[PDB]
Every structure is written in C-alpha cells, then in structure tokens.
Design a protein around this nucleic acid. Sequence first.
DNA 1: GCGCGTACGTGCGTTTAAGCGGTGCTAGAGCTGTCTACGACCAATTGAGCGGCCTCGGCACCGGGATTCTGATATCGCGCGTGATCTTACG
DNA 2: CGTAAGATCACGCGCGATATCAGAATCCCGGTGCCGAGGCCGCTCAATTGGTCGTAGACAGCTCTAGCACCGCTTAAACGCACGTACGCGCTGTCC
Lengths: 97, 92, 83, 78, 54
Amino acid sequence: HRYRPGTVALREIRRYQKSTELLIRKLPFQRLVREIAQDFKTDLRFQSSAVMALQEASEAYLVALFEDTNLCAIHAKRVTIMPKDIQLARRIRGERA
Amino acid sequence: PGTVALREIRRYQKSTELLIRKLPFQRLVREIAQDFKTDLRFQSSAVMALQEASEAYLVALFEDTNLCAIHAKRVTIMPKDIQLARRIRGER
Amino acid sequence: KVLRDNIQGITKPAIRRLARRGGVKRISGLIYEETRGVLKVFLENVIRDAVTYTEHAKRKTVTAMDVVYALKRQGRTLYGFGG
Amino acid sequence: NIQGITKPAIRRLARRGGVKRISGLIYEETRGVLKVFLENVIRDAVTYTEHAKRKTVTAMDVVYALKRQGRTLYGFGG
Amino acid sequence: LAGNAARDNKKTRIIPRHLQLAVRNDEELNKLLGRVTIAQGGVLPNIQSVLLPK
DNA sequence: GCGCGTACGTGCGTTTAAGCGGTGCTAGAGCTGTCTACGACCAATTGAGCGGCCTCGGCACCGGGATTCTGATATCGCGCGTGATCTTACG
DNA sequence: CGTAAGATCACGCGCGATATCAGAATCCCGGTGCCGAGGCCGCTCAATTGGTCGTAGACAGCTCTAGCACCGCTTAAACGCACGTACGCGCTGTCC
C-alpha cells in the first residue's frame, strides 16, 4: 500500500538519531574540502584524519543548526523549515550579520 | 496607538544615558551578592560597570526578541519569543 | 538591614525603556516578569564570578576590576572601567 | 564540486537534526552555509600550517582552528 | 556515567556514543562541555510534539 | 480574508521614594620596615611507562524465526431526521 | 364524528471508536571470524633525594580617604481608571 505523507520522515528521524555514522559520503566532501583549500594555498596535502575531523565538525554544526532551524519554524506555527528560518537562527547566533 | 512607541524608540536610540534607575538596581545587586556571601561592600564604579553590562545585555536580548516576534508574523514581543532567543543563543 | 523583593525595583517603565532601545514597539504583559527573571539569572552569574575573584583577593569590597574580569569570563567583555 | 553535497544528504542531516518537512531552497542555503563554515575553519587551519612550514595540513591544525572558532572537537588528539 | 550508558545499551566496551549520551543526558556535564562536539557522538533522541502524528 | 473578544496606549489624577546637599563617623586599604620558608639546580641514584610482540574475544555478519506497527475496512454506538400510533384540542 | 397539533416508538441516515487482514519494522537467536584490547618483556627516559642560593611571601605598624549613615529638601517617577482601537484568536477558501 502507501504510507501517509510525514510518517516515513518520523521513522527516518528515529533511525538517524539512534546512529552516529556520518551522513555525507566521504569522497564528495573530501573533494569539496580540497577545492576550498586550494583557494588559500596551492599544492597542499591533507591527512585523512584531518579530513575526518573537518567532516565530523561540519556535520555536527549542521545538525545543531538544523535543530535551531526546526525550532524557529515551529515558533512560526510551521512544520517545514525555510531559508528565513536558517537566516534568523544564524542571525541570533551571531554568525551571519 | 503606536506613534509614541516609535517616538520613544527613536528617542532612546539617539541617547546613551542609562535607563534602569540607579538605587533600585544597587539594592538588587546588594541582595543578590548577599545571598552568595555576607558582609560585602562595593566600589560605586563596580556597581556602574555591572549596570552597564546588564543594560547592554538586555538591549541585545530585546533586539533578538523583536527579531523573533517579527519571524512569527507578529509585532508584539511575548515570553516565548525571549525563550526562543535565549535557547538559540545557547543560554540556560 | 534585611533586603527583600528588590527585583521589583526594576519597574515596568524601566523595562519598557530598555525594550524601546531594543527597537521593540508593542510589549506583551507577561514580558516584564520574564525580563526580571532573565536579569536575575544574568546578575547571579556575573556576581558569582566577581565574588569568587574578590574572595581570592582576600578583600571585603568588590572592585570594578572584579566585575570586568567576571564579564570577560562570560564572553561579554566590557570597555570603560579598566582592564 | 559544492553540488556534490547531495540534497538527500542534507535531508539525512536534517532528519538527524529533528526536521520533518524541508523546503526546496533549503538545500542551496545549507550548501552556502556549509561553504562559509568550511571556508573559515580551513582558512585558520591553513594559516597554522603555513606557520608550520609544511605542505601537509595536519589534523592538529584543524583542531586548533576549531578551537579558535569556539567549536572544540574531541577524538583527534585534543 | 559512560559505563552506565554502555550497560543500558548492553555493551561491554565503551564507544563514543556512550560518552555522548552520558554527557548530554547529564545536565552539569552538558553545561561543562557546552562548546564541545564529540566525534562519533551523535545526538539524543528528541522529537518535537507538533511533529508527532495525531 | 472575514468576524469577534480584548490589552493596553493616552490622558488625567493621585501619590511617593529617588537625587542634591549638608553634616558626621569611620574600615580596612595602602604604604614602610622585619623576619623567614622554599624551589631551581647539580650529582647521583633508582625505577616505571611506551612499544614490540604475542594471545584472545564481543560483536558484525549471515540466515532464519518470531513479535509489532499503520492503512484499510466494517460493526457497535450515539445522534439527527422522518413516518406511524396514541393523545389532546378544536370544528 | 372528523381534522389539526403534540409526544413517543420504529426505522433510516450520518459521525466516531474499535474489532480484524496485510506489507513493512523490529527484535531475538544459531554459528563463524576478526581486528582491537590485554598482558609480558626491554628499553630508554622519567622520578626522587643529599645539599645550596636568592627569591618571594608572610607579618606588623603608621597613615586616612572615600565608604557608610542620617537629616532635610525638592521633584521626577510610579500607580489606578475611561475607553476604543488596532491586535490576537478562530473559522474558512485556494492551491502551492
């Protein structure tokens, strides 16, 4: 049959909050890191542990940001996060101006 | 309604003089300190620095509260706005 | 002389002026008590740190330097009173 | 390159964050935010590496950078 | 607290997730590590009310 | 978008403790002279943690079986609407 | 006697909770292998003590200035009510 919209989302929330394995596949993230680094200095090498540290920190930061964004959306009687939610969250955090 | 609100906003954003009255604030600070340890005295400049910090903090908090209220298609700040602002700030 | 209920010394017009400097236009009734609570928490933390520094100094008087050090501890550095 | 951070990956990160419903423009906004964050952290890490006269950014550089930004990380030789 | 958690999760060896659970579930430790992200730590299970089915 | 309940603004009136100044008392901070305990270091001594190398196992994986959970449907129940029978009123 | 209004019973139609099927989740269990954890042995490298020196700190005494308290004065600041008006709450239509 068919699951009603919004149920598999909750199931995925339960599934992912119980696990700790990273959610961005390694190689695209690594290539993004190398691209970003290149603009600051040429011909650079990275220790795999450094890439893992970056990935851990970024993923944790994004998860926290999404938590705050979800709180913002809920504050507006909403259930879908929208760009304005992220902007407000970062603004209050003091990251964005 | 609401005109004098804007007038007051402009007036108090033009000036810098402190908004909380001096002697109630001093009494409150003395009480709070008393509960942490008895028989404390204060340099008046220490009280003034405490008041400056408190007022700056409260004005920034109110800015964030107003930002939260606008986010909810509202114009009046309400306690849940402050709670959201402090949560997002990482305060407890 | 005993001190009691001074937190109400933060009168409604004062909190209102503060919000005005914060750009707020319309203020709900319940805001005032929440603001008093927030102010009390902030003062408790700052004065806890300041009184700790004062105790280490073995002084019976709290100095502005103590307040400035406490504020710098809380990631709320302040200029204009030394340090 | 930046697009390699796939929409569904952002969906997984949000799910772990507790989000139920996601907007279309979110994905791109998240890509921008992640770009900025990586930019700052990697800038600091490189800065350290340059000062170390090494062509190989180390994990210690990343840890020190994250500490600078008030985002301390554990598990890589703190 | 981490050993307690590992017992609750029925494991003999502590892994990061146990440390994360012990820290975040504990109020004072969570406050102390307020600006620390623990590698392979994950998050606590927490679903907002309004997101739950009716 | 529409419709309804209402919190509190301005103004007015009333009342009060917050700043100035004036005096008076003074607590412990700040600045000189005495006196004394102890850690860096050098020699010499001794011993413990890190690493190399062995040994061992709690859990992942596979595969299978058993217990649970939404979506759909349908009966029981309750509530609303209509007709038939009994009752009362009028003609 | 005959017609019209009202109460109750029977029958029919509509909204809500809760018995059942069924595919997808989730948990438990038999049996195997492994890379990480644990222990023993060497080896440097680390920790401790005999004994010295200047250095910092503790102590005591003289000096006093803003810290504290009250009195009187003046007045800007704070609190209660009429009200009505825009704001908050709730229901509803549309389609993104």
